[PDB]
Design a binder for this molecule. Structure first.
Ligand SMILES: CCCCCCCCCCCCCCCCCC(=O)OC[C@H](COP(=O)([O-])OCC(O)COP(=O)([O-])OC[C@@H](COC(=O)CCCCCCCCCCCCCCCCC)OC(=O)CCCCCCCCCCCCCCCCC)OC(=O)CCCCCCCCCCCCCCCCC
Ligand SMILES: CCCCCCCCCCCCCCCCCC(=O)OC[C@H](COP(=O)([O-])OCC(O)COP(=O)([O-])OC[C@@H](COC(=O)CCCCCCCCCCCCCCCCC)OC(=O)CCCCCCCCCCCCCCCCC)OC(=O)CCCCCCCCCCCCCCCCC
Ligand SMILES: CCCCCCCCCCCCCCCCCC(=O)OC[C@H](COP(=O)([O-])OCC(O)COP(=O)([O-])OC[C@@H](COC(=O)CCCCCCCCCCCCCCCCC)OC(=O)CCCCCCCCCCCCCCCCC)OC(=O)CCCCCCCCCCCCCCCCC
Ligand code: HEA
Ligand code: HEA
Ligand SMILES: CC(C)=CCC/C(C)=C/CC/C(C)=C\CC/C(C)=C/CC/C(C)=C/CC/C(C)=C/CC/C(C)=C/CC/C(C)=C/CC/C(C)=C/CC1=C(C)C(=O)c2ccccc2C1=O
Ligand SMILES: CC(C)=CCC/C(C)=C/CC/C(C)=C\CC/C(C)=C/CC/C(C)=C/CC/C(C)=C/CC/C(C)=C/CC/C(C)=C/CC/C(C)=C/CC1=C(C)C(=O)c2ccccc2C1=O
Ligand code: HEC
Ligand code: HEC
Ligand code: FES
Ligand SMILES: [Cu+2]
Ligand SMILES: [Cu+2]
Ligand SMILES: [Cu+2]
Lengths: 213, 38, 165, 105, 276, 53, 418, 139
């Protein structure tokens, strides 16, 4: 009954964009034939799906999404736990150094050293990596959303992907041992903080100690 | 062009046309007289 | 003050980076703020190159030339000003900035030029945090660099004369 | 790897028509302005962006610069396959790689 | 001649529309009368009392006419109480909602197109009965079996008989839209959750006299393609309507069911915007 | 306070999320706070003595 | 700036088809046009005229709070700049309506950063306006010449007093609603959720603010023409106390009609609001009759301020007639959300603010500068304005009477109205 | 101060009557009962006018006629010394700029910019308030 509930839910809100046979309207939507359940999971769970594009709240909730995914697959899969739930902690890896090297070579050019945002050309940008979970990161690098290259499982193995997932989950949630994180970027916030705090306090001390006329 | 603080003197204020009564004093009688004709 | 802010604020966390490798890159840039004007000049200068017989003059030569020209013009200002104004006297009393409008406007113009070059160095951070296009920020810097300093000059001149009045 | 759908919007610089193996192109990664890695590849725009001084190159027009302080195109590498089916280089770059200098590119 | 006095109001195809047009024409006559009076007063005082001639002492300084003041504050109260009375009468007549309708339509509006439902049909002649409701809803939106669905390539056409009670139940999926058939001389907003917002999303027309095709627009602000949510309404005879429903109960699209009864399959008052 | 904190605070790197530390991440902030506050209080006292006596 | 936006809109609206604009661009255009014209020109021009001539009229040397005055000015300027600087965003400026209705303004629909700047700029400008109103009330109450009672002060001063009271009633609730909308958009705050009465809650709050606003931008200009007529008729103002009472009655009634903007929702009590608007229609007629009686039997000369005041009379009469026609719910059921409403409020808004503002500028330019504006250029200006306005906004009644709704970027050649 | 208080009391009377009438006529005859929005707005509008009119009445009932309240008054009656009126000041534009910084930081969700704007607002308001009360530098 998954294939049945999937089509009805798809025919209501998805055929308008892509098509009756999931082949792609020349103006509205893409083909969607070769994509698996992973693209359906990512795009729907991140709220990027049905649209007129930042992340938002999903409309379908964890059962309709699975039915639509099974339907689109029936015409890249998501990873599940041996109990049928979606994997959350199983996707983490143990080689943080390898994950970090791979991230700095493949991913840091667009997001950041530590998964902050990045600017792209003429509008578009790369988002922050904090509000994404492990399955969302996996499906993101498996399907390659807009302007993001698609990383095949044959060019970037599953174990390397798990190491990268572990590395980003550590780089997004570890406490800074040096004081207040000034935004995660380099010396631009540091120069701002310098001019606004240190020099202001020094000049105020000079005004207090010295005279004026 | 009014000066800073807007005034170097003020006239007597008897109605809602004080400048009119100031510049035409031969008219205050004829103003109070024929006002309620309608 | 230095101890407080060296204890409470994190600066240059090298471990979040990695060791340098010629194949990796990040959206990170922008040297320390006192070198940012050279970076911004390199970012907003237009690509003007010259090709003649088996030779090449690339575009960053302009950046190097402007840098050296600033480095030369900075220590020469007292002599340039005394030549222009014709004032060769001894001075022990200071001037109030409002009483020297031309020099105050020159200095304000130079500070405006420096500030434009320093803001042009954080193109990507500005475009990301304040929702502006990257091409837009580049062109904004490129046009401000030429049209803002004289505007600041004019305003500074009139402002000093108003303080005098 | 370019989608087979377009494969007709390529412009193929004068001396590098046989440098691609079908939909594989393999340009250099060193930027021609100041040598930073030109890594930011936008796949549906088909654009290359360097995060150092924000030059942009058109991957469908022999990596010609279209924005920023860069002035020369990125060097392209000839590629092919061997008798075992692995991707190999079909020669050397036809021009120097990286920033320019007094002698040549 | 009254076409020029209506100022562009189309001729109604419904008794309520005709009553509304009557009230509109009367009110326009009254407004033109008052406006002519005031404009004539202004013109008189500007053309003749302008006579600051070559002689002048000063005209006269009068400023109070209390009886005239009170008369001119009394007259407008009456002239607006009459209009309020007739307004209440007509606007109660336009919102009757008789308990037994004969055709019930479920109007659904989503972002930049429409959907129609054919929920129930029950003729008082005993000629045709049909229940098209559907538990396809396994939650405030209504689902039916016979549904016309609009596309950016196909203008949704709604078919209706000529001479029956028609009822419309309006629902929106995302944002507020507008249901306007200019020949109805009536309009209503399409709300996301009408019951939670205390809105009556049901309205009825007594009958549609004329037959033919009429246009309908969206009259809200709903986003980008607000100007591109048009629909059509085909009013046909009851026997052709029964044939249409019987031809669509067997699987057939809107264009096919309309072609099977000798009528144009596509909308004839509008076109799909090719710039979309 | 600076002396005692430097002598007895747990300073080694323990960052993880099995046993989330929150104690290692306060070491350098506490160093800076105590050092700066001490010397700045001495400075303020000297300035006040100069200004009033 | 707003007029340039309107010209772009007209140029696209001619010649069916999308010639040079996009749907999103046209939406941004009418949004920003309405916003600028209503909140960055008229509401601050009211306080411009007030600061120009109110202390001189009550015989005071200064306003009550001279630094709060400058604070209000700079708050206006910077808020307007913040709201306008959404065009430099890749998503563009706000593209919902000037009214910014209920679910269209959330973060799901309309996710750009222009609406945020819009909201915050409106909040800043509203704070400035509130401070200005407080200043004006206090100045009229405390500072006043030693013989000038409250029934000897001019009608312009009376009207500014009343308008300030209305400002203090209306603007704080708009600030509250905008802070609620910002909380929704930035924290997911369920406040205007349609699962609650969130769709009608926004409309009630916004229109409770928004009708007192359209009266806030009318009474000072009534006062302006009330100052101008007696001077050029060489006569006293007809019905002084009657005009004062009419102003007070309009002010009292203006806060009880707000829902005549909600007839087609099926959720308001129609007879209450309909009767209230029919009622509010009367004191305006009393005011018209007093203005006519002022000119009646005088020695009329037609310079530029008098010419502009007569143009105001004509235009506002036609607009008010169309409005009192609009106040009937069964008629609004057809002519709502069409070009008939656009023609109506353009007639009333133009007639009051544009004509009375020009009349006041021509009147008080000598008092503020010591120079006289040219008269031939002023007559040319007036006649150009009159002909252009009546050519551009008269056929729109018919245009909307045959079905043509407002905010349409495009139409078809097979439709009428080309 | 009789006419001002009388004006506000007239407004209060009308607003209270309209509030109660609307509340009852929506309790009955309406779709879901009381409207709960216009009712609250009208009630607290009445409260606004009531507060102002009450303050004016209470200051008027303990006051003697001023020259502006009194017809037949001469200009020589108001001779004397009015209060203090601020000449030139540059603090308002700084307050406006601080509030604009905070507002931009609230529009674009930037907590550091919101904090900086709030600090600037505090500083500039202190500057405004202390302007005519700072004493000479004590050296
Ligand atoms: C001087 C050295 C500066 C370092 C001191 C900084 C500490 C602050 C001083 C203080 O608070 O103590 C009170 C202190 C009390 O002085 P005092 O001890 O009683 O008397 C000493 C002298 O007699 C007082 O003599 P004075 O009153 O005749 O001269 C004071 C002032 C008066 O002279 C002027 O007329 C200045 C007018 C210039 C304004 C032009 C700005 C144009 C902006 C465009 C937008 C326009 C709209 O002249 C200046 O100092 C200004 C020169 C620098 C202007 C550069 C503008 C940068 C533009 C960047 C745009 C991008 O006030 C001062 O006199 C100094 C104030 C200096 C303000 C500097 C502002 C920084 C400008 C950079 C902005 C960065 C971009 C963001
Ligand atoms: C929401 C927006 C809040 C609006 C602020 C309140 C406006 C109330 C004005 C009514 C009367 C105006 C007036 O007296 O003019 C004084 C003065 C105007 O000077 P002036 O025109 O030359 O006339 C001076 C008078 O002759 C005589 O001048 P004076 O020297 O005798 O001044 C009398 C008195 C002024 O009498 C009062 O109005 C006291 C009422 C305190 C209001 C507290 C506001 C709470 C903020 C809401 C939080 C959301 O000043 C004081 O003694 C201390 C006032 C303390 C004000 C502190 C405001 C806190 C702002 C920081 C916000 C951060 C917290 C949230 C995070 O204006 C002010 O002092 C207030 C400035 C408001 C800044 C806007 C804030 C943005
Ligand atoms: C995001 C911000 C980042 C924070 C940066 C770092 C913050 C550290 C504090 C800044 C500098 C440290 C000051 C050390 C001196 C303290 C000793 C003292 O209080 O003597 C009074 C001292 C008077 O000494 P004086 O030599 O006899 O001068 C007498 C003349 O009559 C002077 O009379 P005047 O006519 O020349 O005008 C007085 C003028 C003089 O005040 C200043 O000049 C201070 C500002 C200079 C900073 C440089 C500005 C450059 C911007 C361009 O101040 C004002 O005009 C009003 C401004 C309000 C100041 C207090 C508001 C604090 C808000 C906190 C939030 O005035 C002050 O410095 C008071 C300001 C500091 C307040 C005390 C600390 C409060 C901490 C906040 C609690 C949370
Ligand atoms: C200054 C601006 C201004 C003014 C003065 C008015 C004045 C009036 N307005 Fe208008 N109105 C607007 C600005 C204004 N309006 C705006 C901006 C909108 C829509 C905004 C938006 O949606 O974007 C609007 C919308 C609007 C609507 C809703 C239309 C719709 O959205 O469907 C209604 C209906 O009740 C209405 C009614 C009135 C009435 C009854 C008056 C009365 O004040 C007029 C009465 C005055 C007259 C001049 C009568 C003349 C008197 C005599 C001479 C005696 C005549 C005797 C009789 C005929 C009784 N207005
Ligand atoms: C005071 C308020 C005010 C004023 C003065 C105007 C002035 C004008 N308006 Fe506007 N209008 C509104 C308030 C106003 N409007 C409102 C509230 C709406 C509804 C908004 C909504 O839908 O959300 C609206 C909507 C509106 C529409 C419908 C848009 C849409 O719904 O599709 C139209 C189109 O016919 C229009 C036309 C005009 C014209 C031709 C003028 C002319 O009077 C103005 C022409 C003036 C000029 C052309 C200026 C001259 C320009 C220059 C010389 C260029 C110089 C350039 C620079 C200096 C930068 N207006
Ligand atoms: C400037 C550019 C053009 C963008 C401005 C933003 C734009 C969308 C609106 C401006 C409004 C304007 C045009 C009309 C007038 C409004 C009024 C005059 C005031 C508004 C001006 C604004 C608010 C000033 C800020 C300008 C901005 C470019 C300065 C940059 C400051 C630097 C980049 C901050 C660096 C910095 C960053 C980037 C952090 O992420 C960070 C994170 C955590 C801690 C610290 C920091 C930190 O210091
Ligand atoms: C006499 C009287 C009348 C007035 C005297 C003043 C007069 C107007 C002077 C004439 C103007 C003229 C002489 C100056 C021309 C400009 C200059 C000197 C030409 C070249 C200067 C330049 C190549 C040397 C500066 C050093 C740098 C820029 C060389 C390259 C360079 C190096 C070497 C770095 O290490 C570096 C590190 C980090 C960032 C950038 C750079 C960088 O650009
Ligand atoms: C016409 C509006 C529209 C709606 C409605 C819509 N889509 Fe899309 N979709 C697009 C467009 C345009 C893209 C192209 C990529 C992008 O814009 O991010 C896309 C991309 C996708 C992709 C990824 C394409 C790829 O190459 O990987 C999937 C999967 C998808 N849509 C499925 C869905 C699902 C599931 C829904 C839920 C009903 C939906 N679409 C509704 C327009 C729409
Ligand atoms: C500049 C090219 C680019 C590269 C290279 C890139 N990204 Fe992305 N990434 C993007 C863009 C653009 C999006 C936004 C997709 C969208 O909006 O639909 C995105 C989205 C994502 C998301 C989802 C963000 C969210 O809010 O859910 C994740 C997770 C992610 N990328 C991780 C990665 C990883 C891991 C890598 C390295 C394998 C990588 N990215 C490499 C540009 C890139
Ligand atoms: S290094 Fe790539 S643009 Fe300068
Ligand atoms: Cu719509
Ligand atoms: Cu209204
Ligand atoms: Cu509406």
């Amino acid at each position: 009954a998954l294939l049945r509930t999937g089509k009805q839910l798809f025919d209501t809100s998805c055929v308008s964009c892509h098509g009756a046979n999931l082949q792609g309207v020349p103006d509205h939507g893409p083909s969607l034939i070769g994509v698996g359940e992973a693209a359906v999971y990512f795009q729907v769970s991140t709220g990027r799906m049905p649209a007129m594009a930042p992340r938002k709240d999903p409309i379908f909730d964890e059962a309709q999404i699975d039915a639509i995914g099974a339907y689109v697959q029936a015409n890249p899969t998501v990873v599940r736990n041996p109990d049928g739930s979606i994997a959350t902690q199983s996707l983490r890896g143990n080689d943080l150094g390898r994950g970090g090297d791979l991230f700095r070579l493949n991913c840091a050019s667009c997001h950041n050293f530590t998964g902050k945002g990045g600017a792209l050309s003429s509008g578009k940008y790369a988002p922050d990596l904090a509000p994404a979970n492990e399955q969302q990161i996996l499906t993101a690098m498996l399907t390659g959303p807009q302007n993001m290259p698609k990383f095949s499982n044959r060019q970037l193995s599953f174990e390397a992907k798990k190491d990268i997932i572990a590395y980003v989950k550590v780089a997004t949630e570890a406490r800074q041992p040096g004081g207040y994180l000034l935004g995660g970027f380099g010396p631009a916030p540091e120069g701002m903080a310098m001019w606004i705090i240190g020099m202001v306090a020094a000049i105020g001390l000079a005004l207090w100690i010295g005279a004026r006329s | 062009p009014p000066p800073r603080h807007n005034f170097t003197e003020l006239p007597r204020i008897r109605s809602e046309r004080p400048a009119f009564e100031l510049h035409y004093p031969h008219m205050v009688e004829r103003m109070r007289a024929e006002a309620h004709v309608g | 003050v230095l101890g407080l802010m060296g204890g409470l604020l994190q600066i240059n966390p090298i471990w979040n980076l990695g060791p340098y490798k010629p194949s990796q890159v990040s959206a990170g840039s922008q040297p320390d703020f006192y070198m940012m004007w050279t970076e911004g000049l390199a970012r907003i200068w237009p690509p003007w190159e010259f090709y003649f017989w088996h030779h090449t003059i690339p575009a960053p030569v302009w950046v190097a030339v402007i840098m050296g020209l600033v480095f030369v013009l900075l220590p020469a200002y007292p002599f340039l000003e005394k030549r222009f104004t014709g004032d060769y006297a001894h001075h022990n009393l200071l001037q109030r900035p409002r009483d020297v409008p031309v020099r105050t406007a020159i200095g304000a113009m130079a500070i405006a030029f420096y500030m434009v070059l320093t803001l042009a160095a954080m193109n990507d951070i500005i475009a990301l945090k304040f929702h502006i296009s990257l091409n837009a920020t580049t062109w904004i810097g490129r046009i401000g660099m030429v049209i803002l300093p004289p505007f600041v000059y004019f305003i500074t001149y009139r402002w000093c004369i108003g303080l005098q009045r | 790897r370019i989608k087979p759908s377009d494969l007709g919007r390529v412009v193929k610089r004068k001396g590098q028509e046989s440098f691609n193996f079908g939909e594989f192109f393999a340009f250099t990664k060193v930027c021609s302005h100041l040598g930073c890695p030109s890594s930011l590849y936008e796949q549906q725009s088909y654009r290359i962006l360097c995060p150092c001084h924000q030059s942009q190159f058109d991957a469908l027009h022999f990596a010609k610069p279209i924005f920023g302080p860069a002035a020369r195109a990125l060097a392209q590498l000839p590629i092919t396959i061997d008798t075992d089916g692995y991707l190999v280089a079909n020669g050397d770059f036809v021009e120097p790689v990286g920033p320019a200098f007094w002698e040549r590119t | 001649w009254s076409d020029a006095l209506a100022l562009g109001w189309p001729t109604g195809i419904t008794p309520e529309a005709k009553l509304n047009r009557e009230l509109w024409i009367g009110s326009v006559i009254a407004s033109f009368a008052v406006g002519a009076i005031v404009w004539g007063l202004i013109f008189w005082t500007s053309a003749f009392h302008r006579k600051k001639a070559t002689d002048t002492e000063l005209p006269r300084q009068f400023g109070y006419n209390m009886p005239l003041e009170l008369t001119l504050t009394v007259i407008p109260f009456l002239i607006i109480s009459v209009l309020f009375y007739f307004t209440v009468v007509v606007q109660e007549r336009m919102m009757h909602k008789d308990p037994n309708p004969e055709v019930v339509i479920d109007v659904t509006a989503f972002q930049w197109n429409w959907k129609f439902g054919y929920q129930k049909i029950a003729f008082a002649d005993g000629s045709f009965d049909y229940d098209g409701a559907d538990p396809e809803r396994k939650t405030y939106l209504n689902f039916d079996k016979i549904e016309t669905l609009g596309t950016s390539s196909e203008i949704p056409v709604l078919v209706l008989p000529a001479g029956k009670r028609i009822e419309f139940v309006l629902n929106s999926a995302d944002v507020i839209h507008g249901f306007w058939v200019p020949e109805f001389l009536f309009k209503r907003d399409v709300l996301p959750e009408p019951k939670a917002n205390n809105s009556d999303n049901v309205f009825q027309v007594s009958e549609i006299q004329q037959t033919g095709a009429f246009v309908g627009r969206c009259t809200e602000m709903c986003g980008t393609f607000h100007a591109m949510m048009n629909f059509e309404v085909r009013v046909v005879e009851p026997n052709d309507f029964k044939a249409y429903i019987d031809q669509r109960n067997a699987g057939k699209t809107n264009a096919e069911a309309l072609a099977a009864i000798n009528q144009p399959p596509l909308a004839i008052t509008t076109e799909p915007f090719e710039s979309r | 306070a600076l002396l005692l904190i430097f002598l007895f605070w747990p300073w080694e790197f323990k960052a993880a999320d099995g046993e989330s530390d929150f104690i290692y991440s306060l070491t350098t902030p506490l160093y800076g706070l105590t050092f700066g506050l001490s010397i700045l209080s001495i400075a303020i006292g000297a300035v006040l003595y100069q200004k009033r006596f | 700036v707003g007029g340039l936006m309107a010209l772009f809109m007209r140029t696209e609206l001619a010649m069916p088809g999308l010639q040079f604009l996009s749907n999103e661009q046209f939406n941004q255009l009418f949004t920003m046009h309405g916003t600028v014209m209503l909140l960055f020109y008229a509401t601050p021009i009211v306080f411009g005229f007030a600061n120009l001539v109110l202390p001189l009229q009550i015989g005071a040397p200064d306003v009550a709070f001279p630094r709060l005055n400058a604070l209000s000015f700079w708050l206006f300027l910077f808020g307007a700049l913040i709201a306008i600087a959404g065009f430099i965003t890749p998503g563009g400026a706000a593209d919902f309506g000037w009214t910014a209705y209920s679910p269209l303004t959330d973060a799901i629909h309309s996710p750009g950063a222009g609406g945020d700047l819009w909201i915050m700029g409106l909040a800043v400008g509203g704070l400035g306006t509130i401070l200005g109103g407080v200043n004006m009330i206090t100045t009229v109450v405390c500072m006043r010449a030693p013989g000038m009672t409250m029934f000897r002060m001019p009608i312009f001063t009376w009207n500014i007093l009343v308008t300030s009271i209305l400002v203090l009633i209306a603007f704080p609730i708009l600030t509250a609603a905008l802070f609620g909308l910002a909380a929704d958009r930035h924290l997911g705050a369920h406040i205007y959720d349609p699962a609650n009465g969130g769709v009608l809650l926004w409309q009630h709050l916004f229109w409770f603010f928004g009708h007192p606003e359209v009266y806030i931008i009318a009474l000072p200009f009534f006062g302006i023409v009330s100052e101008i007529f007696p001077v050029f008729s060489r006569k006293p103002i007809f019905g002084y106390t009657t005009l004062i009472y009419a102003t007070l009655a309009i002010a009292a009634l203006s806060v009880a009609v707000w829902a005549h903007h909600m007839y087609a929702t099926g959720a308001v009590l129609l007879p209450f609001f309909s009767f209230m608007t029919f009622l509010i229609a009367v004191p305006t007629g009393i005011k018209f009759f007093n203005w006519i009686g002022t000119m009646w039997k005088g020695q009329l000369t037609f310079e530029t301020p008098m010419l502009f005041s007569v143009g105001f009379l004509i235009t506002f009469l036609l607009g008010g007639l169309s409005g009192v026609l609009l106040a009937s719910p069964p008629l609004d059921f057809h002519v709502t959300d069409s070009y008939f409403v656009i023609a109506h409020f353009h007639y009333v808004l133009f007639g009051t603010i544009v004509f009375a503002t020009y009349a006041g500028i021509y009147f008080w330019f000598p008092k503020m500068t010591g120079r006289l504006l040219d008269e031939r250029l002023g007559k040319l200006h007036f006649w150009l304005t009159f002909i252009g306005f009546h050519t551009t906004f008269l056929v729109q009644h018919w245009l909307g009477d045959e079905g043509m709704p407002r905010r349409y970027a495009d139409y078809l050649p097979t439709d009428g109205f080309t | 101060m009789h006419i001002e208080a009388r004006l506000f009391e007239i407004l209060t009377a009308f607003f209270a009557l309209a509030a109660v009438v609307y509340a009852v006529l929506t309790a009955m005859f309406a779709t879901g009962g009381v409207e709960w929005a216009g009712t609250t707005a009208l009630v607290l509008t009445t409260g606004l006018t009531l507060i102002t009119g009450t303050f004016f009445r209470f200051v008027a009932r303990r006051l003697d006629t001023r020259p502006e309240d009194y017809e037949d008054a001469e200009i020589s009656d108001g001779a004397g010394e009015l209060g203090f009126f601020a000449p030139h000041s540059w603090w308002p534009i700084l307050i406006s700029l601080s509030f604009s910084t905070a507002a931009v930081g609230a529009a674009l969700w930037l907590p550091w910019l919101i904090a900086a704007g709030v600090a600037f607002v505090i500083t500039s308001v202190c500057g405004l308030v202390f302007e005519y009360y700072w004493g000479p530098e004590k050296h």
